[PDB]
Design a binder for this molecule. Structure first.
Ligand SMILES: [K+]
Ligand SMILES: [Mg+2]
Ligand SMILES: [Mg+2]
Ligand SMILES: [Mg+2]
Ligand SMILES: [Mg+2]
Ligand SMILES: [Mg+2]
Ligand SMILES: [Mg+2]
Ligand SMILES: [Mg+2]
Ligand SMILES: [Mg+2]
Ligand SMILES: [Mg+2]
Ligand SMILES: [Mg+2]
Ligand SMILES: [Mg+2]
Ligand SMILES: [Mg+2]
Ligand SMILES: [Mg+2]
Ligand SMILES: [Mg+2]
Ligand SMILES: [Mg+2]
Ligand SMILES: [Mg+2]
Ligand SMILES: [Mg+2]
Ligand SMILES: [Mg+2]
Ligand SMILES: [Mg+2]
Ligand SMILES: [Mg+2]
Ligand SMILES: [Mg+2]
Ligand SMILES: [Mg+2]
Ligand SMILES: [Mg+2]
Ligand SMILES: [Mg+2]
Ligand SMILES: [Mg+2]
Ligand SMILES: [Mg+2]
Ligand SMILES: [Mg+2]
Ligand SMILES: [Mg+2]
Ligand SMILES: [Mg+2]
Ligand SMILES: [Mg+2]
Ligand SMILES: [Mg+2]
Ligand SMILES: [Mg+2]
Ligand SMILES: [Mg+2]
Ligand SMILES: [Mg+2]
Ligand SMILES: [Mg+2]
Ligand SMILES: [Mg+2]
Ligand SMILES: [Mg+2]
Ligand SMILES: [Mg+2]
Ligand SMILES: [Mg+2]
Ligand SMILES: [Mg+2]
Ligand SMILES: [Mg+2]
Ligand SMILES: [Mg+2]
Ligand SMILES: [Mg+2]
Ligand SMILES: [Mg+2]
Ligand SMILES: [Mg+2]
Ligand SMILES: [Mg+2]
Ligand SMILES: [Mg+2]
Ligand SMILES: [Mg+2]
Ligand SMILES: [Mg+2]
Ligand SMILES: [Mg+2]
Ligand SMILES: [Mg+2]
Ligand SMILES: [Mg+2]
Ligand SMILES: [Mg+2]
Ligand SMILES: [Mg+2]
Ligand SMILES: [Mg+2]
Ligand SMILES: [Mg+2]
Ligand SMILES: [Mg+2]
Ligand SMILES: [Mg+2]
Ligand SMILES: [Mg+2]
Ligand SMILES: [Mg+2]
Ligand SMILES: [Mg+2]
Ligand SMILES: [Mg+2]
Ligand SMILES: [Mg+2]
Ligand SMILES: [Mg+2]
Ligand SMILES: [Mg+2]
Ligand SMILES: [Mg+2]
Ligand SMILES: [Mg+2]
Ligand SMILES: [Mg+2]
Ligand SMILES: [Mg+2]
Ligand SMILES: [Mg+2]
Ligand SMILES: [Mg+2]
Ligand SMILES: [Mg+2]
Ligand SMILES: [Mg+2]
Ligand SMILES: [Mg+2]
Ligand SMILES: [Mg+2]
Ligand SMILES: [Mg+2]
Ligand SMILES: [Mg+2]
Ligand SMILES: [Mg+2]
Ligand SMILES: [Mg+2]
Ligand SMILES: [Mg+2]
Ligand SMILES: [Mg+2]
Ligand SMILES: [Mg+2]
Ligand SMILES: [Mg+2]
Ligand SMILES: [Mg+2]
Ligand SMILES: [Mg+2]
Ligand SMILES: [Mg+2]
Ligand SMILES: [Mg+2]
Ligand SMILES: [Mg+2]
Ligand SMILES: [Mg+2]
Ligand SMILES: [Mg+2]
Ligand SMILES: [Mg+2]
Ligand SMILES: [Mg+2]
Ligand SMILES: [Mg+2]
Ligand SMILES: [Mg+2]
Ligand SMILES: [Mg+2]
Ligand SMILES: [Mg+2]
Ligand SMILES: [Mg+2]
Ligand SMILES: [Mg+2]
Ligand SMILES: [Mg+2]
Ligand SMILES: [Mg+2]
Ligand SMILES: [Mg+2]
Ligand SMILES: [Mg+2]
Ligand SMILES: [Mg+2]
Ligand SMILES: [Mg+2]
Ligand SMILES: [Mg+2]
Ligand SMILES: [Mg+2]
Ligand SMILES: [Mg+2]
Ligand SMILES: [Mg+2]
Ligand SMILES: [Mg+2]
Ligand SMILES: [Mg+2]
Ligand SMILES: [Mg+2]
Ligand SMILES: [Mg+2]
Ligand SMILES: [Mg+2]
Ligand SMILES: [Mg+2]
Ligand SMILES: [Mg+2]
Ligand SMILES: [Mg+2]
Ligand SMILES: [Mg+2]
Ligand SMILES: [Mg+2]
Ligand SMILES: [Mg+2]
Ligand SMILES: [Mg+2]
Ligand SMILES: [Mg+2]
Ligand SMILES: [Mg+2]
Ligand SMILES: [Mg+2]
Ligand SMILES: [Mg+2]
Ligand SMILES: [Mg+2]
Ligand SMILES: [Mg+2]
Ligand SMILES: [Mg+2]
Ligand SMILES: [Mg+2]
Ligand SMILES: [Mg+2]
Ligand SMILES: [Mg+2]
Ligand SMILES: [Mg+2]
Ligand SMILES: [Mg+2]
Ligand SMILES: [Mg+2]
Ligand SMILES: [Mg+2]
Ligand SMILES: [Mg+2]
Ligand SMILES: [Mg+2]
Ligand SMILES: [Mg+2]
Ligand SMILES: [Mg+2]
Ligand SMILES: [Mg+2]
Ligand SMILES: [Mg+2]
Ligand SMILES: [Mg+2]
Ligand SMILES: [Mg+2]
Ligand SMILES: [Mg+2]
Ligand SMILES: [Mg+2]
Ligand SMILES: [Mg+2]
Ligand SMILES: [Mg+2]
Ligand SMILES: [Mg+2]
Ligand SMILES: [Mg+2]
Ligand SMILES: [Mg+2]
Ligand SMILES: [Mg+2]
Ligand SMILES: [Mg+2]
Ligand SMILES: [Mg+2]
Ligand SMILES: [Mg+2]
Ligand SMILES: [Mg+2]
Ligand SMILES: [Mg+2]
Ligand SMILES: [Mg+2]
Ligand SMILES: [Mg+2]
Ligand SMILES: [Mg+2]
Ligand SMILES: [Mg+2]
Ligand SMILES: [Mg+2]
Ligand SMILES: [Mg+2]
Ligand SMILES: [Mg+2]
Ligand SMILES: [Mg+2]
Ligand SMILES: [Mg+2]
Ligand SMILES: [Mg+2]
Ligand SMILES: [Mg+2]
Ligand SMILES: [Mg+2]
Ligand SMILES: [Mg+2]
Ligand SMILES: [Mg+2]
Ligand SMILES: [Mg+2]
Ligand SMILES: [Mg+2]
Ligand SMILES: [Mg+2]
Ligand SMILES: [Mg+2]
Ligand SMILES: [Mg+2]
Ligand SMILES: [Mg+2]
Ligand SMILES: [Mg+2]
Ligand SMILES: [Mg+2]
Ligand SMILES: [Mg+2]
Ligand SMILES: [Mg+2]
Ligand SMILES: [Mg+2]
Ligand SMILES: [Mg+2]
Ligand SMILES: [Mg+2]
Ligand SMILES: [Mg+2]
Ligand SMILES: [Mg+2]
Ligand SMILES: [Mg+2]
Ligand SMILES: [Mg+2]
Ligand SMILES: [Mg+2]
Ligand SMILES: [Mg+2]
Ligand SMILES: [Mg+2]
Ligand SMILES: [Mg+2]
Ligand SMILES: [Mg+2]
Ligand SMILES: [Mg+2]
Ligand SMILES: [Mg+2]
Ligand SMILES: [Mg+2]
Ligand SMILES: [Mg+2]
Ligand SMILES: [Mg+2]
Ligand SMILES: [Mg+2]
Ligand SMILES: [Mg+2]
Ligand SMILES: [Mg+2]
Ligand SMILES: [Mg+2]
Ligand SMILES: [Mg+2]
Ligand SMILES: [Mg+2]
Ligand SMILES: [Mg+2]
Ligand SMILES: [Mg+2]
Ligand SMILES: [Mg+2]
Ligand SMILES: [Mg+2]
Ligand SMILES: [Mg+2]
Ligand SMILES: [Mg+2]
Ligand SMILES: [Mg+2]
Ligand SMILES: [Mg+2]
Ligand SMILES: [Mg+2]
Ligand SMILES: [Mg+2]
Ligand SMILES: [Mg+2]
Ligand SMILES: [Mg+2]
Ligand SMILES: [Mg+2]
Ligand SMILES: [Mg+2]
Ligand SMILES: [Mg+2]
Ligand SMILES: [Mg+2]
Ligand SMILES: [Mg+2]
Ligand SMILES: [Mg+2]
Ligand SMILES: [Mg+2]
Ligand SMILES: [Mg+2]
Ligand SMILES: [Mg+2]
Ligand SMILES: [Mg+2]
Ligand SMILES: [Mg+2]
Ligand SMILES: [Mg+2]
Ligand SMILES: [Mg+2]
Ligand SMILES: [Mg+2]
Ligand SMILES: [Mg+2]
Ligand SMILES: [Mg+2]
Ligand SMILES: [Mg+2]
Lengths: 48, 275
RNA sequence: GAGCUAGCCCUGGCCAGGGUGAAGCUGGGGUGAGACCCAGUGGAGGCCCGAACCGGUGGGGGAUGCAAACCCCUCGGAUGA
RNA sequence: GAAUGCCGGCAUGAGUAACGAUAAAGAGGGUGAGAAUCCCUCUCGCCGUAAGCCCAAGGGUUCCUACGCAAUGGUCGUCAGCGUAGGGUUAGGCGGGACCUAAGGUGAAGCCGAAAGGCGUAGCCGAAGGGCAGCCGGUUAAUAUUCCGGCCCUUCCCGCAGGUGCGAUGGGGGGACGCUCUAGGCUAGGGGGACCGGAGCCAUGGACGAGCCCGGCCAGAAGCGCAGGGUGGGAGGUAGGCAAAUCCGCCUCCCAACAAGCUCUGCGUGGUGGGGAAGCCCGGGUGACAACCCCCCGAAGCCAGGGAGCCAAGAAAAGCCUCUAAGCACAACCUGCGGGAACCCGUACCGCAAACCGACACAGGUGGGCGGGUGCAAGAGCACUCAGGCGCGCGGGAGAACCCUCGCCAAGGAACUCUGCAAGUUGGCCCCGUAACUUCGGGAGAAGGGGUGCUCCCUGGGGUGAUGAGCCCCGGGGAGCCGCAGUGAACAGGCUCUGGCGACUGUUUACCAAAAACACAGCUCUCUGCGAACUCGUAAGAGGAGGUAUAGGGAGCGACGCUUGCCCGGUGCCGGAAGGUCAAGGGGAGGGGUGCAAGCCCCGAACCGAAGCCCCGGUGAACGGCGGCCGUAACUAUAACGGUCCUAAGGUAGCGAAAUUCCUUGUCGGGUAAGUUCCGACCUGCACGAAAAGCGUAACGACCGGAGCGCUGUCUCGGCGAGGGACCCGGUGAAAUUGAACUGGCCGUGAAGAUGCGGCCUACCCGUGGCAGGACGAAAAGACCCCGUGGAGCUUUACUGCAGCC
RNA sequence: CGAUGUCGGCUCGUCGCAUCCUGGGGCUGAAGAAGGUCCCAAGGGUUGGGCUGUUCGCCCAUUAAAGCGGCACGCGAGCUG
RNA sequence: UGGGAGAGGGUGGUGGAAUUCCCGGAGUAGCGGUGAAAUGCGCAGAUACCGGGAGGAACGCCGAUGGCGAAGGCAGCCACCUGGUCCACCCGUGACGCUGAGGCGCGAAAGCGUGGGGAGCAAACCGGAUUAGAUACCCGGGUAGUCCACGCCCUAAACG
RNA sequence: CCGAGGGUAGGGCCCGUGACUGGGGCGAAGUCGUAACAAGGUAGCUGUACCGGAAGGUGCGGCUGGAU
RNA sequence: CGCGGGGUGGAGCAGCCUGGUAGCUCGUCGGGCUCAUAACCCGAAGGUCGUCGGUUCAAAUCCGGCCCCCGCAACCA
């Protein structure tokens, strides 16, 4: 049947993207949180 | 005079449509329509705040002249009589000798080709607007402002009318279409006559789909729900109310008055509504 | 977290073919004028049969499966909420 | 040494199940250490509204070529979407940007919130919508509307020429719009040709023929031709289009008017440039100087912004045109022409799938366009096929049980069973024919029947063309032929009678319930006068609604027909300026403390003092409620009638063993040979009853009952056959489970059901195909049930709070 | 209670005997035929339907007869539901 | 041709008396109702009085024993439209007549449908009395209905 | 070919019969009230509507075939 | 051998709680009015309180048993 993951690049960038994150306090905390952990990628890779 | 159908399908048994026989121009004036944003009942938070609305036919809002004192003493010809899906009444197109064009609410009796006008000097004839203090007592008006220069607010729906009962100083006394007795200010504009399309109430939608064309979505009885949803939810099998019949939000929905008491309008209501 | 899902908003798209024959209009009869009847025309409808499409009624299979809901036969809707 | 412990290693089941659609394979010849599996050939079979083709999304080198084979690939591997390496994606015109707006998003002005932040006009952003200029062919191993070739076109800059009051984010026009139906003319696409071109072919009994087979086009600027779209002209006045305005709007005259003209498309033709088959011979080369014509069918596509009807009344903004203002008229703009300038990103490949979503090369899921021919009435249905693509990445044998899908069956024909579950039957089209009932539409495909192929003969009307032939579409009559059978294959209703419930079409528990449930048009009550009520929010602000009582909210009932009785004492709700009670506050009789005193400080009676409650009323389509005991009629029985107790009032009409009846398979009738069900009745209704509606009701229902006809492997009662598994051999090779095991029957015993103890009996060692009685067999720390001063959801006249309202 | 699946049907049986039938008996208020009642006896047999989920029971048509009970109310790693 | 009388009919207007309700003043101990009463209403200010307002229905005197119409029926007043009828003249047609199975039209009240209206009245219903009872007569209330528009129904002691 | 009739399928009318049910008629001496006849003790009758154990009552309209 | 409530002139009801005290309506009987009957009017009688046992000076009353009557409950699988 139709499963849950239906990839869509515009949906990915506008939702989880860097610029989406930076616009709310909770989003900036995520980035701060992941720079602290040393994550290689701060944000989902999406090609545009 | 409403049009019936033949039972060639189960829904056509009772479906009744407007006669449309007073309508004379089938597409609206391009200079005077504009997009009507469908809300779906949602508010600026994206929240359903009025339930069971959406999915109706597309529409364009026709801009309706609810002032008229804009143009004191400039006559206008009744150019045509048009359908408007945004209100129960029909609308009448007006070509002013000024050259300008506007829309008003079509009153009962108005004919294509007649001239109408507005202002203190105007004749007491159907379609004319006057400040309320200048219309003789006993005269059936409509499209009445509630306060001076604030816009036609009362008696705007198909068939309705307020009748002037008397005067008192700077204020006159109106019997609204509800039957209440209110004092409305003298300088307030209204329009001689009653709104047209009185047969509106005898329309029988006929099938659920008709209400879906109007944007009216299926309504759900509290009795059909669960107690997380409604005072009337739950029970095993069917069930009577089991408390005073109430809204999904708690308050009681049979007889409980809800006009605010200390309202300033109270000093101006004379008698509560009719029947 | 509404890329699953539920509702709404905006903007697009899709629905083989066949069948039934509402109003109206015309003509004819009717009458004081009518209502109305007849025939033709017309092409209405949460109309009918039925693919696409959307469903999931009954039975069987499957049951460490092809599949964490599938397969076969059958069945519902298919210009409309 | 135990924690269904944690981590890791290795066992067991086991050479077992499986190896992923039953579309299907066989040989020859290559290659190579090695071949059922890679390459070539011929043969077979499968898809063909797809299993072919082209886009979009998503994926991200998977593309091409060389070289490989450890792992990946359910086997094999020489092959590969695998490994290494090299190569490959080319644009002013295609798509997106340098253009426009839509929901929504952001957001100078502004508003609001402890902070973070929430709003918000304009403006900005935002597309798969609007707008904007490229078509045919060739080329590469791999790119092409991108390179090349031919013919076209767009914008910007500069210049020249003619022209004109030029000039805009401002005014106006336009852009600009639904659903159904549909005209005229074309085009795409297709069928036929006795004509045109073509390598050839005569087989096996016949055919040298008007024979067979193949192929008979594509693009193209100006012009011209056809068909359509769009569009009145002139003048006078003018206060409106937030300045102006010669534009637009409005009014008046004149002229025009199905037209014409002007303008814009489509189609045709059109200089020119291309393409061009079967076969044969090794993707090529020939055919070939290829021919490139006639007729018919014909779109849902095109002209198009076409037409008509209808109600539910159908985006915006730019480009474009026009008007003028600041200005400026050495300018500037329009038109024609010439030269120059024209950037950024995408382009490979997969793309109904082995490259996307499903942990897999997974029988599932995935939007758009094209989708040939023949026949079957039609069609995207069905069968067979073209182009094209495949035989599904384990095989070879055997021909047990058993399972799965499938075929047939003597006689019977539901006797099966909870139930005709399942499977038969029926089945398209044409004609005849068709009941109760009904809301007059329906019921209706009712039921029930007859016809259907082929041949010859005469003939009626259409479309094309010409009015004719030819082609194409609808028919009619007559005579005949063959078979078991003529919708000979494939696709394609079993019917009827009668009850319950729901009017109906719809909706729903994604993944055990599709229903009688939800919804639904309709009916009633009630709230709401507009800064509405109500909803969301602390607020600002929003929805309501750019609505206005024929409207909006809330609640119940649920098409429609005939109807909806009695109770207001109790609870809710509505009304009540009196009275009773009632907090803060007012008042301050009178008490107190302290001081030398002046003072400072505390307590405090009467009394004035809201809403709420009490009290007085009204109110049922408001929450709700609608009796008991005894007596009585000239046979009996039963009581129309009486007596009396209580209540706020004692169930009305209709209906009733019911989706409700306990006793109950009540009793009687019907149906059957027989009927705990069914239908009709009766009424001592355990325990119907009137909008949690009462009683009916045509039509409707994958609902749930009962019966009958048809017909059957459901059954008596089973038999045979087919294929895919099961079995054998070669290849690969899991699993839950498992204290260890050297693991028999009885009668006893035992924590009460023993392979394991006692006594007897029986029993050589080890497998393989089968069956399921035991191992209190596996699976899931029982959901039932209790317990815990465990948890959570829900309720209320439980408690105590809070929001909200007064 | 870190699970002993729980009614009835179907299928497949197997045992008890307090025997329904068939065989052998005694007593009879046994004339004959037919019964009644106790005794011996478990070898074999013990039907097809209507109704209901039903076990049972009732009913129809037969029969030599249409027995009762045990096996986890025998039997769901055999099926049904 | 000229004339006349009339609640004949349809539409649209409009006048005053009265009942009820609502507001204001004044005012106080009852009012109402009956055969007698009670229910009911009234110190929360009723009744009775004055002034103001709203709404519906019926039209007093004229009015008659009268008039009009085929019947049912029709009554303030104003205007429009429209019917029937009588009379005078003796002008025109020249038997063009009478009745009438069918048909068609009209048709009091009550009643029904969809809207509207609702003061008074009043089936049903409630309460008070009466009574053996009182599902009545009498009293206090009271919904349909009575009224308008449209559409039905088609009855009668529709009678002279 | 036609054809008595035989079969299958569906209609129409008539008759007899049916659990139960509706009113009707009749029946020397039942029960309950007292509606009507006199002003029958509320004049009656009427069409219709609603209601009630039952006659009946009430409303709306009509008739005198009503009395004083 | 569940929890309720009840038993009293002829009928239906009070009295019980809270001991001394039996009451209401109808019915029944006698008298009236009437031609008569009913209605009506005037008077009367009839209950040892279901039964037995205890407490008590004393029991319809309070407690206990036995009898009878009506009512509610009977659930989880
Ligand atoms: K339970
Ligand atoms: Mg889904
Ligand atoms: Mg889908
Ligand atoms: Mg999707
Ligand atoms: Mg995307
Ligand atoms: Mg996208
Ligand atoms: Mg997106
Ligand atoms: Mg973002
Ligand atoms: Mg976001
Ligand atoms: Mg920060
Ligand atoms: Mg790094
Ligand atoms: Mg993130
Ligand atoms: Mg209709
Ligand atoms: Mg109209
Ligand atoms: Mg606009
Ligand atoms: Mg909005
Ligand atoms: Mg917003
Ligand atoms: Mg929402
Ligand atoms: Mg709401
Ligand atoms: Mg909504
Ligand atoms: Mg409206
Ligand atoms: Mg309108
Ligand atoms: Mg005002
Ligand atoms: Mg309606
Ligand atoms: Mg709408
Ligand atoms: Mg609605
Ligand atoms: Mg609802
Ligand atoms: Mg519910
Ligand atoms: Mg529910
Ligand atoms: Mg919730
Ligand atoms: Mg809650
Ligand atoms: Mg709640
Ligand atoms: Mg409830
Ligand atoms: Mg419920
Ligand atoms: Mg219930
Ligand atoms: Mg429920
Ligand atoms: Mg309740
Ligand atoms: Mg409540
Ligand atoms: Mg009001
Ligand atoms: Mg989604
Ligand atoms: Mg997605
Ligand atoms: Mg369709
Ligand atoms: Mg279709
Ligand atoms: Mg047809
Ligand atoms: Mg036709
Ligand atoms: Mg027409
Ligand atoms: Mg059909
Ligand atoms: Mg259908
Ligand atoms: Mg089936
Ligand atoms: Mg199928
Ligand atoms: Mg449908
Ligand atoms: Mg269909
Ligand atoms: Mg240990
Ligand atoms: Mg552990
Ligand atoms: Mg572990
Ligand atoms: Mg581990
Ligand atoms: Mg491990
Ligand atoms: Mg290992
Ligand atoms: Mg092994
Ligand atoms: Mg094994
Ligand atoms: Mg396996
Ligand atoms: Mg497998
Ligand atoms: Mg398949
Ligand atoms: Mg198969
Ligand atoms: Mg071969
Ligand atoms: Mg081979
Ligand atoms: Mg090699
Ligand atoms: Mg190989
Ligand atoms: Mg090999
Ligand atoms: Mg192979
Ligand atoms: Mg090959
Ligand atoms: Mg991937
Ligand atoms: Mg390898
Ligand atoms: Mg290697
Ligand atoms: Mg591998
Ligand atoms: Mg694999
Ligand atoms: Mg090999
Ligand atoms: Mg180019
Ligand atoms: Mg630039
Ligand atoms: Mg805050
Ligand atoms: Mg912050
Ligand atoms: Mg954006
Ligand atoms: Mg775009
Ligand atoms: Mg658009
Ligand atoms: Mg081009
Ligand atoms: Mg190359
Ligand atoms: Mg490549
Ligand atoms: Mg110019
Ligand atoms: Mg200019
Ligand atoms: Mg437009
Ligand atoms: Mg528009
Ligand atoms: Mg439409
Ligand atoms: Mg063709
Ligand atoms: Mg075009
Ligand atoms: Mg050549
Ligand atoms: Mg289309
Ligand atoms: Mg178009
Ligand atoms: Mg806009
Ligand atoms: Mg200059
Ligand atoms: Mg640039
Ligand atoms: Mg490319
Ligand atoms: Mg697919
Ligand atoms: Mg692939
Ligand atoms: Mg997944
Ligand atoms: Mg595979
Ligand atoms: Mg066909
Ligand atoms: Mg294969
Ligand atoms: Mg495949
Ligand atoms: Mg074998
Ligand atoms: Mg066959
Ligand atoms: Mg057979
Ligand atoms: Mg049979
Ligand atoms: Mg048979
Ligand atoms: Mg049967
Ligand atoms: Mg059945
Ligand atoms: Mg069943
Ligand atoms: Mg069949
Ligand atoms: Mg068939
Ligand atoms: Mg019939
Ligand atoms: Mg019929
Ligand atoms: Mg019927
Ligand atoms: Mg009919
Ligand atoms: Mg009809
Ligand atoms: Mg037919
Ligand atoms: Mg047929
Ligand atoms: Mg043949
Ligand atoms: Mg069918
Ligand atoms: Mg339904
Ligand atoms: Mg349903
Ligand atoms: Mg119904
Ligand atoms: Mg119904
Ligand atoms: Mg489900
Ligand atoms: Mg669930
Ligand atoms: Mg689930
Ligand atoms: Mg269904
Ligand atoms: Mg269901
Ligand atoms: Mg539901
Ligand atoms: Mg419904
Ligand atoms: Mg209804
Ligand atoms: Mg209402
Ligand atoms: Mg809130
Ligand atoms: Mg709030
Ligand atoms: Mg708005
Ligand atoms: Mg309904
Ligand atoms: Mg009916
Ligand atoms: Mg009450
Ligand atoms: Mg009360
Ligand atoms: Mg109350
Ligand atoms: Mg305070
Ligand atoms: Mg107070
Ligand atoms: Mg209650
Ligand atoms: Mg109560
Ligand atoms: Mg009734
Ligand atoms: Mg019964
Ligand atoms: Mg029933
Ligand atoms: Mg039930
Ligand atoms: Mg019941
Ligand atoms: Mg029962
Ligand atoms: Mg029973
Ligand atoms: Mg029985
Ligand atoms: Mg009985
Ligand atoms: Mg209820
Ligand atoms: Mg109920
Ligand atoms: Mg029905
Ligand atoms: Mg029906
Ligand atoms: Mg249905
Ligand atoms: Mg259904
Ligand atoms: Mg049957
Ligand atoms: Mg078989
Ligand atoms: Mg062997
Ligand atoms: Mg091996
Ligand atoms: Mg392997
Ligand atoms: Mg061991
Ligand atoms: Mg051992
Ligand atoms: Mg052994
Ligand atoms: Mg042994
Ligand atoms: Mg034991
Ligand atoms: Mg043992
Ligand atoms: Mg042993
Ligand atoms: Mg041992
Ligand atoms: Mg031992
Ligand atoms: Mg031993
Ligand atoms: Mg031993
Ligand atoms: Mg085996
Ligand atoms: Mg076993
Ligand atoms: Mg087993
Ligand atoms: Mg076992
Ligand atoms: Mg165990
Ligand atoms: Mg076991
Ligand atoms: Mg077992
Ligand atoms: Mg645990
Ligand atoms: Mg446990
Ligand atoms: Mg558990
Ligand atoms: Mg327990
Ligand atoms: Mg506790
Ligand atoms: Mg404890
Ligand atoms: Mg607890
Ligand atoms: Mg909790
Ligand atoms: Mg929970
Ligand atoms: Mg509130
Ligand atoms: Mg247990
Ligand atoms: Mg365990
Ligand atoms: Mg276990
Ligand atoms: Mg003898
Ligand atoms: Mg013996
Ligand atoms: Mg034996
Ligand atoms: Mg039984
Ligand atoms: Mg035993
Ligand atoms: Mg037992
Ligand atoms: Mg049992
Ligand atoms: Mg038991
Ligand atoms: Mg089982
Ligand atoms: Mg079982
Ligand atoms: Mg087992
Ligand atoms: Mg008083
Ligand atoms: Mg006072
Ligand atoms: Mg009024
Ligand atoms: Mg003469
Ligand atoms: Mg003469
Ligand atoms: Mg009373
Ligand atoms: Mg009395
Ligand atoms: Mg009334
Ligand atoms: Mg008379
Ligand atoms: Mg015969
Ligand atoms: Mg007697
Ligand atoms: Mg009398
Ligand atoms: Mg009465
Ligand atoms: Mg007491
Ligand atoms: Mg006494
Ligand atoms: Mg005498
Ligand atoms: Mg007497
Ligand atoms: Mg329980």
């Amino acid at each position: 049947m139709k499963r849950t993951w239906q990839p869509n690049r515009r949906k990915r960038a506008k939702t989880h993207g860097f610029r989406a994150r930076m616009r709310t306090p909770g989003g900036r905390k995520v980035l701060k949180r992941r720079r602290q952990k040393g994550r290689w990628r701060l944000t989902p890779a999406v090609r545009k | 005079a409403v049009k019936k159908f033949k039972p060639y399908t189960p829904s056509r048994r009772f479906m009744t449509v407007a006669d449309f026989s007073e309508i004379t121009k089938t597409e609206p004036e391009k200079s005077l329509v504009k997009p009507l944003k469908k809300t779906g009942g949602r508010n600026n938070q994206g929240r359903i705040t009025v339930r069971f609305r959406g999915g109706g036919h597309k529409r364009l809002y026709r801009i309706i002249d609810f002032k008229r004192w804009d143009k004191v003493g400039i006559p206008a010809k009744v150019a045509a009589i048009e359908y408007d899906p945004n209100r129960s009444a029909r609308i009448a197109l007006l070509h002013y000798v000024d050259g300008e064009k506007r829309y008003i609410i079509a009153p009962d009796g108005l004919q294509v080709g007649q001239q109408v006008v507005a202002g203190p000097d105007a004749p007491i004839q159907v379609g004319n607007a006057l400040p309320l203090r200048f219309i003789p007592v006993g005269t059936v008006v409509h499209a009445v402002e509630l306060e001076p220069k604030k816009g036609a607010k009362l008696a705007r729906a198909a068939g309705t009318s307020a009748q002037i009962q008397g005067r008192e100083g700077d204020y006159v006394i109106l019997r609204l279409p509800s039957g209440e007795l209110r004092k409305v200010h003298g300088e307030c504009y209204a329009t001689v006559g009653a709104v047209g399309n009185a047969d509106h109430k005898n329309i029988v939608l006929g099938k659920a789909g008709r209400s879906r064309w109007l944007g009216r979505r299926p309504h759900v009885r509290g009795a059909a729900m669960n107690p997380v949803d409604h005072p009337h939810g739950g029970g095993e099998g069917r069930a009577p109310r089991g408390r005073p019949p109430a809204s999904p939000w708690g308050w009681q929905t049979k007889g409980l008055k809800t006009r605010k008491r200390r309202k300033p309008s109270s000093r101006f209501i004379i008698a509560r509504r009719k029947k």
